RNA sequence: ACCGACUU
């Protein structure tokens, strides 16, 4: 039981028209709930960021640089392998905006996040 | 509108 985001994903653009799917991808997968794998810890799709690169690195002080691999290798063996393949974004606050946003958009890659249940 | 769970 259970499967990844990316499955999903790749499921519907095999499935649906690439340009429509463009739409769908947005309309089905914002709003599912998500958890992730590290902690399996709970979060639902809010943005979707396509073609992001392994190379984003986590502002704790705003000039600290680590990897996904950095800091996930460190926690566990596994290895990320998504390489511009779309990476899920969880959006702290919905439509309305505050301007400042005070903690940064968290960036969870496609395997690292599986389906919790709440997708059906 | 936390889909009935959360910091990257």
New binding site residues.
Partial sequence: RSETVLDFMFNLYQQTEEHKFQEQVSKELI??????K??N????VDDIDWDQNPKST???ADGSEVSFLEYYRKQYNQEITDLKQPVLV?Q?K??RGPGGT???????IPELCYL?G???
Avoid at 31 to 36: D, M, P, Y
Avoid at 41 to 44: L, S
Avoid at 102 to 108: K, V
């Fill in positions: 709003g599912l709930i998500v958890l992730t590290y902690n810890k709970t979060y639902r986590f502002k704790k969880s702290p919905r439509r005070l903690p940064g958009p968290a960036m969870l919790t709440l997708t059906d």
